[PDB]
Amino acid sequence: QSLTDQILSVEQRYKEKQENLIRSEQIRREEVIYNAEQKLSRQMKLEE
Numbered sequence: 001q002s003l004t005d006q007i008l009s010v011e012q013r014y015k016e017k018q019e020n021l022i023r024s025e026q027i028r029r030e031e032v033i034y035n036a037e038q039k040l041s042r043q044m045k046l047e048e
Helices: 002-036 038-045
Strands: none
Touching: 002 038
């Protein structure tokens, strides 16, 4: 029963390293996209 409690605890710890992974991937794709949107702003250089 303790092992079950261990097991669940560790499973939650495994999720943490994987939340870090999901956020790493999700945040990163958006970061690339809104680096791409810098060209919206270069096309604002156009306004300039």
